[PDB]
Amino acid sequence: SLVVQEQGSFQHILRLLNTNVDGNINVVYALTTIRGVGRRYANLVCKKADVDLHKRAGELTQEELERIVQIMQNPTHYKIPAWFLNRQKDVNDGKDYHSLANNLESKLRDDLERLKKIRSHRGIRHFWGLRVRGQHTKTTGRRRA
Amino acid sequence: FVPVELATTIPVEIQQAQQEIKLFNKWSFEDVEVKDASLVDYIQISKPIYVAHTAGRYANKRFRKAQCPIVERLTNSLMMNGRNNGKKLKAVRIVKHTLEIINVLTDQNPLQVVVDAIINSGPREDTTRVGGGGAARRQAVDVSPLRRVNQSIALLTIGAREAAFRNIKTIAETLAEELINAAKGSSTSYAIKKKDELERVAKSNR
Amino acid sequence: AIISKKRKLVADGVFYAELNEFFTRELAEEGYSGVEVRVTPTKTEIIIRATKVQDVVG
Amino acid sequence: LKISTRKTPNGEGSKTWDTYEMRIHKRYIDLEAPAHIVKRITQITIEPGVDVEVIIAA
Amino acid sequence: PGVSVRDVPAQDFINNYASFLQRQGKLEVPGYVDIVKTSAGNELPPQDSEGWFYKRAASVARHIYLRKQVGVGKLNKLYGGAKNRGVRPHKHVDASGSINRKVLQSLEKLGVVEISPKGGRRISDNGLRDLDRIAAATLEDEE
Amino acid sequence: TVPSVQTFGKKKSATAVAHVKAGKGLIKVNGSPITLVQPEILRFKVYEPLLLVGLDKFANIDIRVKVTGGGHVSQVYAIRQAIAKGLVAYHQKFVDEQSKNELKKAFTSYDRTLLIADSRRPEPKKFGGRGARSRFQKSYR
Amino acid sequence: AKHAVVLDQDKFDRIMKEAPTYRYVSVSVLVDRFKLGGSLARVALRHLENEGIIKPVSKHSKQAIYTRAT
Amino acid sequence: GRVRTKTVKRASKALIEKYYPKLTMDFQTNKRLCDEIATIQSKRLRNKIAGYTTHLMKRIQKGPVRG
Amino acid sequence: TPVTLAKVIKVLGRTGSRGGVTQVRVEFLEDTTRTIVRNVKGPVREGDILVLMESEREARRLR
RNA sequence: UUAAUUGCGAUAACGAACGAGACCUUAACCUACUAAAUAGGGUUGCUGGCACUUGCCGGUUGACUCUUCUUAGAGGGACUAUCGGUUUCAAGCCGAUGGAAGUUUGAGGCAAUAACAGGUCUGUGAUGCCCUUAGACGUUCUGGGCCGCACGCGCGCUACACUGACGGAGCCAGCGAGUACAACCUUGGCCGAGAGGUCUGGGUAAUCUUGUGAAACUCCGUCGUGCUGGGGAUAGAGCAUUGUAAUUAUUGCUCUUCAACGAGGAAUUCCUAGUAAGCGCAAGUCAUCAGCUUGCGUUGAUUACGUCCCUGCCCUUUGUACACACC
Ligand SMILES: [Mg+2]
Ligand SMILES: [Mg+2]
Ligand SMILES: [Mg+2]
Ligand SMILES: [Mg+2]
Ligand SMILES: [Mg+2]
Ligand SMILES: [Mg+2]
Ligand SMILES: [Mg+2]
Ligand SMILES: [Mg+2]
Ligand SMILES: [Mg+2]
């Protein structure tokens, strides 16, 4: 029933993992701005941390943030089932992997390169600048972007 | 006067709103005067309705539209735009909200305000595209009361819709505002502005 | 035995049609006109109407 | 029983459809009797087109 | 004159039941809470997180009370909705069956829900009593 | 032995069978009391057979309605219709004619659908179109 | 974010001194005079509603209109 | 929309000619009479004919009519 | 500017080019026995009251 | 005049036929019949929960009876009826009133004379003639292709949000379809975040799937108008399923990625009432695949109830050097 006030004791407008995680946006829906952290995953992370979901990302104590960060890079440590990740069973090692922020893109690029090297159809398509997933293009996508 | 209960006991409010006055959503259809000679018989009121949702056979004959409660018509109008189309419950809800808003501000019967708005947004003289060959020149022409009513109903709804396009101001509030503007002839309302423009055009063409 | 009732009916019709076709094919010289099918107890009764009865009989 | 067919054999033309429908009448009657009597009843009163069917016994 | 669940505003009743469950602590949470979809055609887990599986359970119980015999598939059907299949029209998709099953099991453990002849599940007498009590409480609150 | 009659209400596809009995004054829809129904904005439609003629007639008549088919709105309408019918029917049977007539008048003056069941029914769809009348988009280039 | 809807204390204070003998007290209304919105305006209203003053007339989902005690 | 055909009107006229005594005024009676006398195949057609006859009768009780 | 209230006596045949106008004989309320005929947009009828802007003006067939 | 060469009429024509209409199927009404444990009720047994007085909601094919809802047989019912206007006081049209029904009562099925070098010889053991006829244009396997993309256009789907989005919760349909020589529809119980497995069933079906508790919707909450939690394209990886075979993702699911689009110019389609539009469901193909299709319900408007201005068609009067007919 009561509004939780705070004049400005908890400082707004923050940065987490290189880039911007801004205020007035919710604790979960500002983690989406970080590449690799989508929605459901973000929510899960938040739950693991134990943060109020009625909270702005602009607030948050540092310890909580640290905990969240910890959760992020290594989720198999925690109570996350780890079978909803990017690289589950993996391309190389055979481990549960979920890359984040500036790493996922790099990993993707690497994968693409590998594919190209192998000389599989998808790689060839990528090289060309075309549709991999059999979406036959007599029409559709006519601006090259 | 006299509350008597049954086996399945009914809430007190319902009991209160019964025999003496057939209230609308929760206030009287009585008072509420058509303050215009013409648009009588073409604005309904009179017959006391409870909800702005009847079954209705109003597009059947010719003037079956005129014997429909104005609230219902308004709701129908609101119902427009294809994404929203159908879903009359929503429209009804919106109407209710609007009514409540009206009640809150400047008091009165909201119904009365609505009636006033309807009266004061219906254009008196229109222009038809008559060329006498094919030229885009226009001719000054009188307006039917039904037509006046209908256009007025349309215009307010349109305005409301426009207001709603990217806004916190939930349609209902906007509608209420429009009504207020209309009843007390403002020129800040959209419908009224349109009407004025039409009038000007007519004057020019004459 | 053990087939859906509507389906069975359909099949019956189909069979009748087939029979008719067959008759048209064969009994053209005899001048075939119409078939009737009666599925009574024990025996199925096929009634043929043709212009040359004697020929049909053989 | 419903069927929908394009009236065309070839496909060219304004796309016009058929609604070939076959209506099935199914009706049942319940009797408490000795079986022989039932059989007697049902051995006669057979008309071509109508399927007579007996469940018999509980 | 007498109280039953059939005479109560439904949402309120459900809420009350959920509250009661919470108070109890007794149900058995399987531990899928804060991970799962509820319906396999959804964009999000629950927007309450801590609980609302209690709420779901309560709802299920209410449904059971209302009807005769209820199963898992049926429950799924009831609870699932329209999945946004992208640039393609929506379709009815059944809810997460396992969750429903778990809920049922929990209910059984509690002594609210009972395995019936023919197939499926009905209500226990204790469960019925509990429901009645809840209804009464709700009525009191309303008053 | 109790004075009772079986009147229905129909709208679109929905049917609501109301049993009107002698007794205390119950109005129940699918086992749940009249006070619920719960499209909520259309709750007053279901009240319209009660309050238009008054609760005075309801003191001795018990109404048990079973509603199936249609949607929600339609169902509600059907229920309302059934309620309207039932009292009238009872009057015709077990009370008196004048009273029944009065009731009818009360009903008839406010809304038509209460006694006369609605005429309208879905037009069948036909080929070359999405709906009954609306055709596909014809193109000449 | 184009502001008006944040948190603050001055704003809250202002809201509090905007309730007795008042016509309009909604969410939209609140937003209008450069104040809070969403599911904060409602809370603010309640904060005054709990201590008399503001009375509820309509309590629909994501639409609510309020009137002071007469 | 509703304009009666040859096969209604002519028939009605014929009926009137034959049976002006005993084909009187009100609808139901007229219909019954039609059913009795005329060998009308359909029901609807018969009904239509009866209606037409009634109309003709009505017209008659205000002066004579052509044909 | 003056405004008159005109009561319709006879519907005087649908005119215009597209039939979007109804010609109508109107005998106005506070000056009865004046039979000035005018062209009206919308669904009009006998006994209808029309709010117009020019009391003495004739509207001829819109061709 | 009419939806109509539909009629009233006028009249060197008179009486007719085909088409229209009639018809038939369907959709509406039936407290009037004939009926039911493959439909639904009533009381009443036993029985579960209640207040606790008799009363309220229940579970059971335990009895007995009923047919309002149900199905579907035989009937009936509307004929523009009754009245009021209006019109050679005609055909008719308009308005009340009663009624289930008053737009041909709603929707179709059928549909003339004469034709078109319209489309099919890729439906045919319908088919002329010509080709071909053992390195066959017969076939049959095997892989690929029909699906390729600088690009034009043609139906559509998804959307550009606040009349919303997402979460709960509430929670209502009608058409259907469904296997024994196969493998159909598949509840209910356990396992799995899913997809799915699995064991068991019930059903050749008003009996079981199925009350297809379908969506849109309604209730309370989280974001409040920022390419934002609008929107979902490409992508990356995994887990399933059908099939002998899934790369040229078959498809289903899981996390991640988050592109174009703030309602669309020149244009132009469809539509007048349970219609437009919204929303699912359903059979059709189908081993597997729905953005398609025939149906079906659910929610349900706005606006004419008119006119030849445009467009196409028809007729009348005219002109013609055209009659392969203005190409
Ligand atoms: Mg959407
Ligand atoms: Mg008359
Ligand atoms: Mg017809
Ligand atoms: Mg050709
Ligand atoms: Mg050949
Ligand atoms: Mg097409
Ligand atoms: Mg079924
Ligand atoms: Mg995004
Ligand atoms: Mg395919």
From Swiss-Prot, chain F:
Residues 121-141 are annotated as: Disordered. GO terms for cellular component: cytosolic small ribosomal subunit. Belongs to the universal ribosomal protein uS9 family. Residues 132-141 have a biased composition (Basic residues). One of its GO terms (molecular function) is structural constituent of ribosome. Transmembrane segments: none annotated. Keywords: Ribonucleoprotein, Ribosomal protein. InterPro entries: Ribosomal_Su5_D2-typ_SF, Ribosomal_uS9, Ribosomal_uS9_CS, Ribsml_uS5_D2-typ_fold_subgr. Pfam families: Ribosomal_S9. The lineage of its organism: Eukaryota, Fungi, Dikarya, Ascomycota, Saccharomycotina. Gene3D superfamilies: 3.30.230.10. PANTHER family: RIBOSOMAL PROTEIN S16, RIBOSOMAL PROTEIN S9. This is Small ribosomal subunit protein uS9. GO terms for biological process: maturation of SSU-rRNA from tricistronic rRNA transcript (SSU-rRNA, 5.8S rRNA, LSU-rRNA); translation.
Curated annotation (Swiss-Prot), chain I:
It holds the Pfam family Ribosomal_S28e. InterPro entries: NA-bd_OB-fold, Ribosomal_eS28, Ribosomal_eS28_CS. GO terms for cellular component: cytosolic small ribosomal subunit. The keyword Aminoacyl-tRNA synthetase does not apply. It comes from the Eukaryota. GO terms for biological process: maturation of SSU-rRNA; ribosomal small subunit assembly; translation. One of its GO terms (molecular function) is structural constituent of ribosome. Keywords: Ribonucleoprotein, Ribosomal protein. Gene3D superfamilies: Nucleic acid-binding proteins. HAMAP family: Ribosomal_eS28 (MF_00292). Belongs to the eukaryotic ribosomal protein eS28 family. This is Small ribosomal subunit protein eS28. It comes from Kluyveromyces lactis (strain ATCC 8585 / CBS 2359 / DSM 70799 / NBRC 1267 / NRRL Y-1140 / WM37).
